[PDB]
């Protein structure tokens, strides 16, 4: 007879999706843990009074780590190491003397501290960009050496240093005479109202050369290409320091160090400032789901113990079943401080505009996606509180969550995780299965529409037809599925394309456009796929003889107006700029009027604009009737068949499309369109 219990702190979510009703109590407990931790954090002040969550995070990165005082020329260094009996700062600055610079004060928190006076001549005691370590003496008397956990730069060893010590990274004290000063404002952006179209990029591979390309090169040579394409945002992968390049950035060693293989912190600041000057937001891949198992240059056994940053190996909760990585103890207050400060550091010091949290499925579940892990979810809820407080109404957070955890992207006040978007990570496999298993005459229009529109209510989605995952050596891109190993001989504009190439180009544009318009509330493109980049991506590793041959991006292809890669590129630019003028991404789901299984025609309206796709492999249609709700005059604003997009220029884009007041496909009006085989068009109503 008991009333079904719907606690007030998840009423918002339950109203959004009443399917959640039988889970309301477990959802309420999940939020409640996060809300109690939030209270704990906001009262972690000397007198126990309330502080803001932002102030907590900012005070943390301003007081942990090493800080040079530019006025007094002192240096302060503090380091959390509860298991260590003694701590010493060693480095080039003191010829690695293990006695002269003890961090004598160990506080109630287990934090060692030291202040270094200026030198007799007034110089900083630690030279700019010289090497440092902290040495701990453990209770048993043994010694271990570590890169400080909050170091802002860590570099690969020289050939000689690695001959004597191995590949272990070296910590650097970064204190340049002239820090980069930001000159440009963040672009105007309202998360609730504005569309975000995301260019996913990796600095190291961003040149045609088989090398690690630099921050400066990206700023000079790639940013203009992204501006030309009209993307709203760049998602920078592999920025947090990682010693193993082929990890793609996912094995993080130094959480507060931007990767040094691409250049200096000031080079990356300039990169982000320049993106901002061009109106482009910059997002960071944040890997807070696990850490590299490296000791000394990583956090594993940092203080000599197996229960500081990570759940212990004997707890059964301490290592990943596949990644060979350690798992954070999110219930430790100092680990919460470390991770939350890390987010504020990247927003504040580098002016990133938001984050993509990688590994969210591994965080959410006690078995990591092969029961929910309440502590990891509560940390993500705090993380969203903080990021949205740092940049109110502008900040973006995005979850990489393959599981589709309900409420992940509902607001925290509703009882949800607080993410703005999740990745639509099932969508690439739909396109691969069609291309690999079904003949073209056998494409099911309804199954395409169902998969693209199957989105949880209220949980906004970044759609894409392929991502950095699929570009990798494990799989083939859409370009490879559609055109195999096509070469410059197949891609010349000076001869008629084969059937294969003609079909590949048309579908490459059509698949992107229907994903972009029907599949989500935001869009993502992985670097190179906007122009159908050939071959595949691969990083140097043992399995390929440390080759960089595939660790690059042939951007030169786009500049050759006698090849067809540029046709794909120009269409991508047209798609993004069309959406910028005629919003359809961050809008309610489409109203689909047609998914015709014999004609292979899909038609829908979204945000008042009309979208028509003829997927039929051979049949062209003339005077094809399309239902339209709002009567008026329509004009084509995007046309896949245009010559400069690599089409055959059959469609007259000057034509005025007048509606006729006669019911059709459950709409009050119709227009009539010419749609050749494998073409698509977008129309908007003229005012
Ligand atoms: O001491 C100067 C020399 O070493 C510097 O730091 C190292 C320590 O001094 C050193 O004791 C070292 O300990 C290593 C062991 O000797 C060795 O067996 C190795 O295999 O494991 C330990 C590595 O941690 O620890 C540090 C390493 O940074 C500095 O690195 C050198 O540039 C300097 O020439």
UniProtKB/Swiss-Prot annotation:
From the Swiss-Prot or TrEMBL record, state where the protein is found.
Cytoplasm
Keyword Glycosyltransferase annotated:
yes
User: Which residues are involved in binding (1,4-alpha-D-glucosyl)n?
Assistant: 96, 133
Thermal activity characteristics from the UniProt entry: Optimum temperature is 25 degrees Celsius.
Q: Which InterPro entries match?
A: A-amylase/branching_C, Branching_enzy, Glyco_hydro_13_cat_dom, Glyco_hydro_13_N, Glyco_hydro_b, Glycoside_hydrolase_SF, Ig-like_fold, Ig_E-set
Q: EC number(s)? A: 2.4.1.18
Q: Which UniProt keywords apply?
A: Cytoplasm, Glycogen biosynthesis, Glycosyltransferase, Transferase
The highest taxon in the source lineage is Eukaryota
Biological role stated in the UniProt entry: Glycogen-branching enzyme participates in the glycogen biosynthetic process along with glycogenin and glycogen synthase. Generates alpha-1,6-glucosidic branches from alpha-1,4-linked glucose chains, to increase solubility of the glycogen polymer.
Say which family it is in.
Belongs to the glycosyl hydrolase 13 family. GlgB subfamily.
Catalytic reaction(s) noted: Transfers a segment of a (1->4)-alpha-D-glucan chain to a primary hydroxy group in a similar glucan chain
Where's the active site on this chain?
358 (nucleophile), 400 (proton donor)
Q: List the residue(s) that the UniProt entry marks as the site Transition state stabilizer.
A: 469
pH profile of the protein: Optimum pH is 7.
Any GO BP annotation = glycogen biosynthetic process
Q: Does the keyword Cytoplasm apply?
A: yes
Q: Name one GO molecular function term.
A: 1,4-alpha-glucan branching enzyme activity
User: Quaternary structure?
Assistant: Monomer.
The scientific name of the source species is Candida glabrata (strain ATCC 2001 / BCRC 20586 / JCM 3761 / NBRC 0622 / NRRL Y-65 / CBS 138)
One matching Pfam family, short form? CBM_48
The family database entries (CDD domains) matched by this protein are listed as: AmyAc_bac_euk_BE, E_set_GBE_euk_N
Pathway listed for it is:
Glycan biosynthesis; glycogen biosynthesis
GO CC annotation: what is one? cytoplasm
Q: What is this protein called?
A: 1,4-alpha-glucan-branching enzyme
